[PDB]
Design a protein that fits this description.
homodimer, about 425 residues, alpha/beta, 9-stranded parallel β-sheet, 5-stranded antiparallel β-sheet, 10 helices, elongated, binds rubidium ion, lyase, bacterial C-glucosyl deglycosidase, C-C bond cleavage, C-glucosyl flavonoids, Microbacterium testaceum NS220
Chain lengths: ~425, ~425
């Protein structure tokens, strides 16, 4: 599993419990040196969170190669290593632990290198990082998930499948959402070895597959001299192909994103018969087809009405709505340097859908993508008003998943902290709404 | 096989031959979309290097899932994909190809996303990047290698073993040097599965194991109340342990980095008996033990003298010198962000060992780490006078390996371009000395 660039890992920063009582907190630390080394060459790690934690270098305990040691023990041990491929697991004794949130964590790590003169030893590594503790808030009655979409650009450059699931598991989330043509290697023909490993990974990290995103690419052959549009039979043969893939990998929902014909994203006219021809298979496989309502499409709009009209006309219970919470965005996505007003579509400033608009549709809202862009060290989201959305969603009786779709700056590793902040934010709000 | 963050990869930028004549050049491109896509949704890639190439998007050829297509074929095909996990391989027809060096590649890649309104399509990505062509120059008489030490910090965060080896093979290097306690997982007990895959990888990428870095950590238990010192028998057991590991993994050299007791970096007193107690096993395994001359130790120093004195008092052919080319640094490493003029270590400004001093040691020089810090887009190395170093090495008769050891700023991915520039510069210089 790959390690984060920052020596202080975001993943694993959590309170530690024994028989129900919280005994302290841990975090993980990637070895800074160019090699793993003998554990006895460690000279400790001072830890500080201002106002909550302040301990000298010999106090934290070290879990290395499956066992926990004091520093005094590390000094006298033989054969124990801090292997380069493992983050060191640092436990800090703190009864009751740490409160939910983002915490500015400062470490002073000391390592003895025998090939360096004593007048420059030990080697000392000082770093600080705002890190998000795994959420203590329950978050009832919502179910908590993460889409691998949240890790776009990270995935495949700094992140692999096992690393992302480990990041999702640590958040206390239970649901993983994926994009079929993104995260299924050799799509649409994943190897038997890949699939076996997929279910092993779900078992290991306690995750269940939720939504698998898929496409109906109507413009498949729109270019060149022999251009053509996509037939109904081709649309459904593709949708059916992704329903079976989904079932095979254990997903309950499939979101086909359909090619559009207009500014506010009216799907291609083949969309209706493509879905209708696909509903028998989705019922047979027990998979729900849920198209996505995303900005600039609001809840009150002819495309939602037609989706709901399909539900009435067919009678089906394997067709539903997937909401993207960017329809609720009430503050603008920032301008980048060099851009100026009017150079971008209106909806990027937010279409401010009234969260209550979910009341009249909620019965058909089967899945929710918790889209967001930026959440700071104080758990302040800069675009999505989470309290009213959640209030409305709760009062309306929604009890399904909220699946993180981070879509902020794709700076390397940024998405890991961001997803963590969203889960800490949302679960805390859900708990205060219960009161 | 992770991909580099820049959309234009450095690995795979090379001239392309068929029956000896260069037909053009290729580069590799990471899919920027959040998914892999059917190949017919590609609308082409424009390519430019000022003064060398300027082609429109319908001209480059595309290799995808094992086969090469024109754009017009991609538009008409079915079932071919640009998988998210595969960089696209872009071929630009150009008889004679490109000269050696860094080139400023600008691409204009277009993609058709059906779910986005026509007035905002095709989706377009313009990036420019300085990428170093895989060396055309011979580089004889030296042999060319890379130490995974060059990829420190990237290794384990953005890079794994196979990705590293792919990058070394593409450079046309043949030798891979590793650090045992860095890159052997579960050191010192790699699994039979990892060892088998190691040998699979080397065969696949045409690489040969050269040097395994190793340590004798005399300060193993220097801290705590029960502090002690490393005995000869423990030191020799640690060396003999790395000798066996290196043999099992197929290396021919082991560089023990012995803990020091002073600022001229005089090894710990036990070093002589540790080595003498280890020469039979290195002889029985046919592995050479070569300690490393690193700055601030010059060639003209008791440390080097005692090394050569050991060779002669023992008669061994399994003890040698490893030279680190930083001892030849004639210009200063720049002041790190925020540092103080003078507070840094002294030798980091370079100790300027005369390149001719290799004539007196060359008969016992078995391996050379090509330490460098920074080489810019015109192949200007800012620290290491390569031409006199390389000319001295050639006139002294050295025909061994020059193993890259990038030690510049550890910006994510920067080591990749840096090593490629290193091999391009040196192979080109070497070729001029052949005249
Ligand atoms: Rb979405
Ligand atoms: Rb070195």
């Amino acid at each position: 599993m790959l390690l984060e660039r920052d020596l202080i890992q975001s993943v694993g920063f959590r309170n530690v419990r024994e028989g129900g009582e919280i005994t302290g907190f841990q975090f993980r630390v990637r070895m800074p040196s160019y090699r793993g080394m003998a554990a006895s060459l460690i000279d400790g790690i001072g830890v500080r969170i201002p106002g909550l934690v302040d301990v000298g270098p010999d106090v934290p305990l070290w879990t290395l190669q499956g066992q926990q040691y004091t520093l005094a023990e590390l000094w006298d041990g033989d054969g124990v290593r801090w292997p380069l491929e493992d983050a060191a697991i640092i436990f800090v004794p703190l009864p009751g632990g740490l409160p939910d949130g983002v915490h500015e964590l400062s470490i002073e790590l000391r390592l003895r290198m025998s090939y360096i003169p004593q007048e420059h030893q030990p080697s000392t590594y000082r770093v600080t990082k705002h890190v998000t503790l795994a959420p203590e808030a329950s978050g009832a009655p919502f179910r908590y998930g993460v889409s691998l979409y949240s890790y776009m650009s990270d995935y495949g450059t700094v992140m692999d499948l096992e690393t992302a699931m480990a990041s999702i598991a640590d958040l206390g989330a239970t649901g993983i959402e994926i994009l079929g043509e993104a995260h299924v290697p050799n799509y649409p023909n994943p190897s038997d070895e890949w699939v076996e490993q997929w279910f092993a990974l779900l078992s290991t990290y306690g995750l269940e597959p939720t939504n698998m995103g898929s496409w109906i690419d109507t413009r498949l052959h729109s270019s060149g001299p022999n251009g053509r549009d996509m037939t109904v039979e081709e649309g459904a043969a593709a949708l059916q192909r992704d329903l079976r893939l989904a079932k095979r990998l254990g997903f309950r929902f499939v979101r086909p994103k359909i090619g559009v014909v207009s500014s506010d994203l009216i799907p291609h006219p083949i969309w209706t018969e493509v879905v209708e021809a696909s509903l028998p298979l989705a019922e047979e496989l027990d998979v729900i087809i849920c198209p996505e309502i995303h900005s600039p499409t609001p809840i009150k709009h002819e495309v939602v009405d037609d989706y709901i009209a399909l539900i009435r006309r067919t009678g089906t219970k394997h067709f539903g709505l997937l909401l993207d919470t960017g329809i609720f965005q009430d503050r603008p996505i920032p301008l980048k340097p060099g851009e100026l007003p009017g150079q971008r579509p209106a909806f990027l400033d937010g279409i401010h859908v009234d969260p209550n608009d979910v009341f009249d549709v909620i019965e058909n809202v089967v899945f929710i993508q918790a889209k967001f862009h930026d959440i700071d060290e104080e758990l302040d989201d800069k675009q999505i008003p989470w309290e009213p959305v959640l209030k409305a969603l709760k009062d309306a009786g929604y009890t399904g998943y909220l699946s993180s779709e981070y879509e902020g700056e794709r700076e390397p590793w940024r998405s890991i902290e961001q997803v963590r902040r969203q889960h800490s934010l949302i679960r805390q709000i859900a708990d205060r709404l219960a009161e």
